[PDB]
Amino acid sequence: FVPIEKLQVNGITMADVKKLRESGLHTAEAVAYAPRKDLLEIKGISEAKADKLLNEAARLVPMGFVTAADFHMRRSELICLTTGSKNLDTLLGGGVETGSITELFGEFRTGKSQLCHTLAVTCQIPLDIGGGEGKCLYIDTEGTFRPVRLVSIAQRFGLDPDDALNNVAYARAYNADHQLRLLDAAAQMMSESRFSLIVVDSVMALYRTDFELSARQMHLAKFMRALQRLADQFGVAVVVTNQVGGNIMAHSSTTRLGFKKGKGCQRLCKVVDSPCLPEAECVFAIYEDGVGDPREEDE
Amino acid sequence: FVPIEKLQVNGITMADVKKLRESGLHTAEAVAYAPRKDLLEIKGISEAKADKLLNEAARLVPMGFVTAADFHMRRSELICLTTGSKNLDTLLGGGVETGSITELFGEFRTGKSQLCHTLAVTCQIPLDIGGGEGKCLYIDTEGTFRPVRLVSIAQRFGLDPDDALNNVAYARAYNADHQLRLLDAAAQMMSESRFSLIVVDSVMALYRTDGELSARQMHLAKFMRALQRLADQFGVAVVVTNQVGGNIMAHSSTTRLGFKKGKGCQRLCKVVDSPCLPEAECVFAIYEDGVGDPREEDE
Amino acid sequence: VPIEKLQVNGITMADVKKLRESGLHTAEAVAYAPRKDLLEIKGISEAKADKLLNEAARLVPMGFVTAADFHMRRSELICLTTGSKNLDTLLGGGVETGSITELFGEFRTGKSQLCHTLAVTCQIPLDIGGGEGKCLYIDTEGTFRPVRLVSIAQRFGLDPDDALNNVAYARAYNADHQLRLLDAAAQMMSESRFSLIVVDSVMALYRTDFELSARQMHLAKFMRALQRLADQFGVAVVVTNQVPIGGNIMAHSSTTRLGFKKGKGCQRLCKVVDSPCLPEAECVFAIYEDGVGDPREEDE
Amino acid sequence: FVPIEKLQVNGITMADVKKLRESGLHTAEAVAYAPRKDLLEIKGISEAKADKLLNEAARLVPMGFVTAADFHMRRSELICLTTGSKNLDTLLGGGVETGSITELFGEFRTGKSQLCHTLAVTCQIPLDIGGGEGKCLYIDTEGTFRPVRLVSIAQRFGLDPDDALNNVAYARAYNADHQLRLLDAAAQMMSESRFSLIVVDSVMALYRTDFLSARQMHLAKFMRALQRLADQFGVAVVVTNQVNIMAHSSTTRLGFKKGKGCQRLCKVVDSPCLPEAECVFAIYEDGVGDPREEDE
Amino acid sequence: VPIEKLQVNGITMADVKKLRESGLHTAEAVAYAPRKDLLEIKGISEAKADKLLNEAARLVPMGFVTAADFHMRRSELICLTTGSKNLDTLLGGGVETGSITELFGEFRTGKSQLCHTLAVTCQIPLDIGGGEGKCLYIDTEGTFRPVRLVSIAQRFGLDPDDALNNVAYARAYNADHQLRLLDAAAQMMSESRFSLIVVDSVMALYRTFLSARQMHLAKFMRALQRLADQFGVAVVVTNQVGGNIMAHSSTTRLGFKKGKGCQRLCKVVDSPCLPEAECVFAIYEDGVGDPREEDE
Amino acid sequence: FVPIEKLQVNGITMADVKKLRESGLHTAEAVAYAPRKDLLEIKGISEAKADKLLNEAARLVPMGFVTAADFHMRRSELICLTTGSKNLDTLLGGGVETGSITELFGEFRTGKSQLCHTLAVTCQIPLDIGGGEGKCLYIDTEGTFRPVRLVSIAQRFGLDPDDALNNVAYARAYNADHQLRLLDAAAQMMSESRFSLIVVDSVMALYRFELSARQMHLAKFMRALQRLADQFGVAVVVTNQVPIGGNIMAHSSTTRLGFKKGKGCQRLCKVVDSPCLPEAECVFAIYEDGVGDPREEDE
Ligand SMILES: Nc1ncnc2c1ncn2[C@@H]1O[C@H](COP(=O)(O)OP(=O)(O)O)[C@@H](O)[C@H]1O
Ligand SMILES: Nc1ncnc2c1ncn2[C@@H]1O[C@H](COP(=O)(O)OP(=O)(O)O)[C@@H](O)[C@H]1O
Ligand SMILES: Nc1ncnc2c1ncn2[C@@H]1O[C@H](COP(=O)(O)OP(=O)(O)O)[C@@H](O)[C@H]1O
Ligand SMILES: Nc1ncnc2c1ncn2[C@@H]1O[C@H](COP(=O)(O)OP(=O)(O)O)[C@@H](O)[C@H]1O
Ligand SMILES: [Mg+2]
Ligand SMILES: [Mg+2]
Ligand SMILES: [Mg+2]
Ligand SMILES: [Mg+2]
């Protein structure tokens, strides 16, 4: 991404920069994608200078037309992260794709939290072996997150236990308003540092008891679009878990994966929906050290 | 169509042509269709020479009266793009007509994006099979375009895997203002070469996520009107996808096709609104290489 | 009455050509026009304008007319046939030749289908309700398809070739072009018999081009021109409207108004919202591939 | 009225009477009310002849003020025209009165055309039931006139349909000049046959498109001509309008408002003697009348 | 922390009393409460409620934190030993305080014995697996036998009078009484330090409820979760062999099987982090402990 | 215990008390332990009336928390019924605890009927020697009622045989509804007179139903038995054949005693379920005078 401090030019005061940052925008992409009406609504900003900064960002941030072959090259360039099972990578065609809010849904005790822990660890590892080189962002709504599993999985991957311990931002929410307030600080801290993943587990746990359906349904809509807005500005893959959101999950999520409890430690994962993948299923396994491919003993 | 650089006659200099270039009228047809008052509102153009260039444009572009024979022959000579499915081809009366807006709508995962991707390759094929011998353009709003689908489909008609990917302009919109802003750039770009298709997917996805209830319709009308002008200016097929506006989208779109999810790869299509087509219904199957007729194995 | 007929006791052809370029192509057009309009035209003197005015007035009756004579004259007016017996009975013969008829309602009500049906029928002989005159179609939304015309002609049995040969189309890209189309079309209404003008739609261009007052008197000018054409040539005029928006400018001009309501599938309800003569009522009609008609019992 | 034939006394030449008829003077009242200056303006009329005719006509009818004791009682026996509804008759205190000017203003679809049709059909019934015992004169300026209507209304009132249609004179104007010109033939018909009601519907419609000071002066000339015709021929005058000179010239003014269904609210606004009150009247296929109990 | 720190920024004592009437005994519940719940309280304005929430957030930590601090916080969490070191090793110190531990299995295996045993351990010092707090035992079948409590206290060396004078028994005859017992007990856990809640059982009353049972059970279970959150107290419940509805909120689940004589087998069936394994313990008159050579 | 008559305060009509008596609630303790619904379907009782009854019961009877010391001292003061044999009383901690569910299951013709008759006789002797000083109600279902044995045990303990016979109300059970009516009448005159022991021999004689419906109705019979025990603190003893019922009856049975037929008239009794008393065994004997300690001649 591009920092917002590289955007001010032609006698635009830093005070305007603070005013924009206090409103939630923290990068050039955020300003460029932001509608001009919202920028005008911010107090203490002239509309003429608002349009000046908007067109300066448009000159800086590229959003013009481009040939499809170039788009193919850029999409091949996109960072992709190994899940931890070669079968999963083959099914995903390389692994989890950033810039896309992937959803993993299914019945509980199928390894969703274990897979999320493995995802955080594989986002801690360097990009050379396919890692993300960035910090995760884990939002828990049930108290299930346990650092011991992270330590074990990191030791499987060989990373420093303390680096993995201190490079994950964990925050447990207690109500829907707490989640929404938490997202703002999440974005603010996202601004300064380099991250590579935002995992939420689970969105509906608090919403199930906080509610009155009409207020609940609209409250997710502004919540989820915040994750979508944050994903494109910073280019971080977004993973959402769920229990068995209706149409909101389907509309918001790009690639969906259903989970099923297989025999023993083996588990089934199915590509229910995808923009460029066929509906195919495969099998992985979960051990005390994380997530891997099923072994001959597991057969 | 009629290139703009051939209407210059009877004492109009290139300065007026450049002024029209900033005015947006990039074709003799465009200036002929534009109302006189808009020409008067253009700074630096006197009303006398405005009416002059208007009458040379009207001489060069026929605004007069045509019989049903002439317009019927022109209808016969209109270019239609093959849908890749004989059932769908017959449902559409032979393809997608020029200078008319098609609105595919329905619930998600019904294959609208697959239909758009399939159409994106039929334009470049030789016209004898039912193409248009041109180069496509893809304006996206949800980030679901995929060159890999074009790679897979180009082999159905034998097209080159890279000549298909270097002859498709691409761009993405992020906010409501950018969606309308892209159209002037599209018109400027398309004035140099024969485009044959435009895609907008989807229309109101940004408008729902953008008191505000009244203000969105007026913005929607301004954007949707611009597409209708674009089709008449250049004679190209524009395809807009919709999710489930109301009257604004119902009135503007020339043709409307509703999609429904069937069993497996089977999907149902119904002509919801057309001026000269019966309200029929057909079935089509999405395969690895695009949209096609259902197979006996899947039936 | 032909314009070339007005040549009496020394009408110079230069004055005739001046009238031609002034837009007046019918004897009624000069008979009804005020003298100030003639004086506003260059090359026209006041005394000669007055004498040509009286020469025009002595042909067409321009005085008191007893109500009985007006009633018998109006009862002889050719009523266009819409093919649907229900709607034809609703309006006492259908659309009348020489008055402004407006159709309005929500979307998906088949007004365009009715316009198409009237366009096809107005070419059939008088016995089957046609006007025996070529049709004119000013379109502002590109909703004309000359493929269905052949099918409708087959339903009405008249030959397809001459039925297609006997229509004129004009696409309208702007309100100024829409107004100029009437001036353009006046001469060919003065060249061969005409019985039907269709405009679709009225409000579409003014909705986008507009500022309220400017739109208001521009629409007033357009409606005045339409009424002038209807009076001069005696040709039926049908216009399409979508929903009212604009207030009363279209309500005062529109002699007849119909409102369309969605029914069940092919069923639609027509209600005479405004009419100086016929009482407010309602009726039902259906649309099929052959055109507008009365719904069948199976469709009920 | 008094025909101009008896005006000639002591060998007054018939040529002068013919010239007066060609000048719009068809009755002795017109000559009496005409000043000397317009008589001088007429070609072939001398000053001596002008003053002689003024003396002959003035000695027949007075012009100045009168004693109110006879004035109010003589105003009672004036011809009244019922509107077919008791609400309006009570509101007007006798209904429409001839020899005056009454305006009906309001929005469209308020029955103004319908009430004008009712007046035009009710002007022939005998005076015992609020009739007029005369023929109407309808001037139309929008094409709204639909004869058929009348037949049904006359059958409601029991008059013969053929007589109802044949005894109503109808004119249509295409321009303001044509509208003004029709008044010459109107005056000629007034001279030829007895009429007792005039309707204009609508007076202002053409002036919207035909035209500003020229428009105002033309309206003033039109209204003064109508007032004059009412003066000589004792014909009630009713005008229609859509929503200062017209109000000033008008004596009685009634505003119309749309009620519920067939019901509409009629209100008296300006009147020399009548108070300010409203009423409700219904309009049906048969015409204008009092609301039925079913609509209540 | 006590809600007494809330008396800042000019908010009156009356609001604190109203909150105490609604069970808002400690500041943790005030902070975790949603807006609507505190809005429902009578005599409370939303304007001051915004502040109330602000200082509630300031007093108790609510923002982001790195996982190192979370791990070191949960590592030093108080754990209550069961007297069976085999269990301790299996549970990594014993039962956690502030979470939900569920027991299921055959009644012949014996779980009420463990419920009795844990009652005294909450008072012994922390260095030997104690809690140093009060215990609140709720029974639904009247199995409370203080003689076993005296025996286990003598095994632990504590005074039986101290054991009987420190724990609080409560019995419920219905689901509503069970629900309101928690509300009543909130005052006692507010006024004094408690370190253990034992429920035996949770499905007994619900057996003698079908759809409304799930909502009632969810409310009761989330109330038990709230009590652990608002005071850091351990919560342990028993369940005879709910289902999935209990399973969602079940942080830890232990299944029991009957072995040879007094020997019993305990399996940690479900746990967020702990592996799936089994162990063996024994039951004697002194309580539940590690198996001895006599049972081997 | 608190009589139901004294419960009605503050406008509670006596007809409501009569309706409660007819329904089955004969004491204020029953209303105190009565739930919301059970009071709701009682005739003549409304929601406000039920709330008033519950409030009055809470005022009269302590409904809240009870400390361990108070519960222990109340249990200590509870009257225990002697068995007439030193060994059984020693194994039972002084005898049978009143107001508790005790099940005696064993082989037929092992003196279970004799033991029940002995307990019925000993529940009327003075408290100084472990008696009850109250009436007795013996419910027999197997036709084992023997007045001769009752007279013999009365002579053994010095009780007057006629005073022993008239102090015991004998009830024979034919059907499940019949025994429910019998226990309803039992509570009916318990509301007006004091008793000391309830004997049911045998429970499973009439149940052996429909297998599932047998459990809930038996549980309701167990539930009804517990209600009266808490209302009056009277010992209840039920005999079981050879245990039938399984989990439900095991949970209902607060204490269980298995019986075996030893040599001669001697019999063996062993505890099965006891939260406090450890499991052990004992031996007793049966003679014409009833059930007592074994003698040296049979030992
Ligand atoms: N320490 C561990 N070592 C190995 N496997 C474990 C461990 N803890 C849990 N599991 C496995 O993980 C599963 C729990 O899945 P989980 O990630 O909790 O799904 P959810 O979060 O949806 O409940 C259990 O079925 C169990 O078999
Ligand atoms: N390579 C493929 N082969 C066959 N079917 C596919 C392939 N890729 C996607 N599909 C199917 O086509 C559908 C595409 O739906 P889509 O056009 O994305 O709907 P929307 O545009 O409304 O989101 C998906 O449901 C998917 O199951
Ligand atoms: N050839 C045909 N056969 C049968 N039905 C048709 C045919 N053409 C159009 N229709 C149906 O009739 C309707 C016509 O409505 P339309 O004329 O578009 O109303 P409007 O012009 O007022 O928008 C359309 O909804 C269409 O589904
Ligand atoms: N044949 C008829 N039967 C019943 N009612 C009619 C008939 N003809 C006209 N009307 C009614 O008369 C009214 C005409 O109003 P109109 O007099 O034109 O008002 P305005 O003169 O103010 O425009 C219409 O509202 C209509 O309902
Ligand atoms: Mg989970
Ligand atoms: Mg799509
Ligand atoms: Mg249409
Ligand atoms: Mg009218």
Numbering used by the authors:
A (entry chain D): 80 to 290, 295 to 327, 346 to 400
B (entry chain C): 80 to 289, 294 to 327, 346 to 400
C (entry chain B): 81 to 290, 295 to 327, 344 to 400
D (entry chain A): 80 to 290, 296 to 327, 348 to 400
E (entry chain E): 81 to 288, 290, 296 to 327, 346 to 400
F (entry chain F): 80 to 287, 290, 295 to 327, 344 to 400
What text does the study give?
Most eukaryotes have two Rad51/RecA recombinases: Rad51, which is expressed constitutively, and Dmc1, which is only expressed in meiosis. Rad51 and Dmc1 are both ATP-dependent DNA-binding proteins and both form extended helical filaments on ssDNA, which are key intermediates in HR. ATP binding promotes filament assembly, whereas the hydrolysis of ATP to ADP reduces filament stability to promote filament disassembly. Here, we present cryo-EM structures of S. cerevisiae Rad51 and Dmc1 nucleoprotein filaments in their ADP-bound states.
To solve the cryo-EM structures of S. cerevisiae Rad51 and Dmc1 in the ADP-bound states, we mixed the purified proteins with 96-nucleotide ssDNA oligonucleotide in the presence of 2 mM ADP. Under these conditions, Rad51 yielded filaments with a resolution of 3.37 Å. In the Rad51 ADP-bound structure, the helical pitch increased to 132 Å, corresponding to an overall increase in the contour length of 33.3%, there were 6.5 monomers per turn and each protomer was rotated 51.6° relative to its neighbors, and the filament had a maximum width of 95.2 Å. The extended helical pitches observed for the ADP-bound states of Rad51 and Dmc1 coincided with the disordered ssDNA density, consistent with a weakening of the protein–DNA contacts, as has been previously reported for human RAD51 (45, 46), strongly suggesting that this structural change is a conserved property of the eukaryotic members of the Rad51/RecA family. Previous studies have shown, mutation of H352 within S. cerevisiae Rad51 to alanine, tyrosine, phenylalanine, lysine, or methionine, severely compromises both ATP hydrolysis activity and nucleoprotein filament assembly at physiological pH. Consistent with this model, we find that Rad51 H352 and Dmc1 H289 move away from the neighboring protomers when the nucleoprotein filaments are in the ADP-bound states, corresponding to a shift of 4.8 Å in the case of Rad51 and 5.3 Å for Dmc1 measured from the epsilon carbon if the histidine side chains. Comparison of the ATP-bound and ADP-bound states reveals that S. cerevisiae Rad51 D374 and Dmc1 D311 move away from the neighboring protomer in the ADP-bound states, corresponding to a distance (measured from the alpha carbon) of 2.7 Å in the case of Rad51 and 3.7 Å for Dmc1. In the case of Rad51, residues R308, R312, and D315 interact in trans with residues T288, D289, and R251 of the adjacent protomer in the ATP-bound state. In addition, residue K216 from one protomer contacts residue E295 in the L1 DNA-binding loop of the adjacent protomer. All of these contacts are disrupted in the ADP-bound state. The stacked aromatic residues of Rad51 are maintained upon transition to the ADP-bound state, while Dmc1 S48 maintains the interaction with R248 and therefore S48 is relieved from L189 in the ADP-bound state.
